[PDB]
Amino acid sequence: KPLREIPGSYGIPFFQPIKDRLEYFYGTGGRDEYFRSRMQKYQSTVFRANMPPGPFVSSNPKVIVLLDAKSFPILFDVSKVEKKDLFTGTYMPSTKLTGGYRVLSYLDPSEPRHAQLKNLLFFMLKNSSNRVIPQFETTYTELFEGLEAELAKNGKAAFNDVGEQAAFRFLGRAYFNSNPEETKLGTSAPTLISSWVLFNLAPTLDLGLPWFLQEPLLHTFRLPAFLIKSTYNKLYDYFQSVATPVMEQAEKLGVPKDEAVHNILFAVCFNTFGGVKILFPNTLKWIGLAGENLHTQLAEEIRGAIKSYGDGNVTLEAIEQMPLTKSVVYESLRIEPPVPPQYGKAKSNFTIESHDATFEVKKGEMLFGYQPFATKDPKVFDRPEEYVPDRFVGDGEALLKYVWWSNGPETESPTVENKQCAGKDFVVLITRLFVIELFRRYDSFEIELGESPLGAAVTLTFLKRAS
Ligand code: HEM
């Protein structure tokens, strides 16, 4: 792995980053092709490039792109990369969109608030551990029934929307033992959230609209924050009134209730809901396309495990007896990371290596990793583009080191020192719970795919119940 200069060019200072983003958003093949073509052009998995949003929302679009399993890990090393205000890349949404505060996700570990706020969330998680499984069953059973009816009535049932409502209803129940639907919020939370998220991420979001529409009004200037305050406040009122026990733990940690509510709202709506809104449909899709053989093997493992080690109910002890289910969730997180982009700013001069070279990174340079390419490295995973259910079973566990959906090796856990997802254990558990409730109720099912900015819109067409 001989030392080499990083290939790639940032081009003319204002012209290039705009041209590059047009390619990124409208070029044939999408952002995937954007990265694959440069890879081919430079015969390298590491190269220089501009990234959106460009020219007005961002004052520095320059980055070093990482696409292989060997160089990517640098993004985890907080001793070498700073993780300040780069949660969303080369720009940061306005803090007016977050109560005037810089919430946890944007804080570098060297910031006192990072440890405080993260500990606050660890509290919120731990403090709900006994509601997770019970509330999940209740919430998702509701969802499934609803889907069965809709299906029985129209032959087809869209999953996304109603799944989002379930996700949010589930979170209020688990996190705060509250049903958001039994409040002013009704079933509109998924809509209020998406709306608020649009304002934050518009600069880098592809809504599938014509460039002559997206460029002038989504990709050049930040959207006026005052327009979304009405919406934001509705969410704020909910959390402020139902997160009392967490808000108090905050003050004990040294954080005012105000700043607590804003951070809580963010973690639940942005971090959690945002990730689940994507993770679940994707998991449902991969499973659905796996075939009947897998459906039977899963239904079989899960039911037997529940009955033999759960005594009729779902319990941690039982989940531990479902090796295929565990692998199935891990494969879904590997093949299609819910949140693909991770950034890191070099705190000093150091070197990194890809599979065939070494590169010098100079202090201040922005490192960027497109996870989907990194976790599909053929030199790590055989048949990387295929969904292999038992990939992580038995000896497969030796690879968990490479599943990076949480912005860290799956084998590691979030700490106040690192920037790994604070709810890592929670999402893996609730995802396993999703698969579980799915195969207790059904033996098999079929789906059809649509198109959207979430990747794939899933629609259920058949539901063979257990009975
Ligand atoms: C499947 C759903 C989820 C996915 C895919 C996901 C993904 C991620 C990723 C990729 C990061 C790293 C961002 C970066 O610095 O570049 C992150 C950070 C974080 N996530 Fe999640 N997350 C999920 C659910 C949750 C949940 C449910 C919580 C709630 C407690 C949570 C809390 C956090 C926090 C607090 C951070 C920042 C931690 C820090 O500042 O060190 N996440 N998440």
Curated annotation (Swiss-Prot):
Annotated (13S)-hydroperoxy-(9Z,11E)-octadecadienoate binding sites: S194, K277
Catalytic activity: (13S)-hydroperoxy-(9Z,11E,15Z)-octadecatrienoate = (9Z,13S,15Z)-12,13-epoxyoctadeca-9,11,15-trienoate + H2O; (13S)-hydroperoxy-(9Z,11E)-octadecadienoate = (9Z,13S)-12,13-epoxyoctadeca-9,11-dienoate + H2O
UniProt keyword annotations, A-Z: Fatty acid biosynthesis, Fatty acid metabolism, Heme, Iron, Lipid biosynthesis, Lipid metabolism, Lyase, Metal-binding, Oxylipin biosynthesis
Required cofactor names: heme b
SUPFAM superfamilies named in the record: Cytochrome P450
Keyword Iron: yes
Family statement: Belongs to the cytochrome P450 family.
Protein name: Allene oxide synthase CYP74A2
Organism listed in the record: Parthenium argentatum (Guayule rubber plant)
Source lineage: Eukaryota, Viridiplantae, Streptophyta, Embryophyta, Tracheophyta
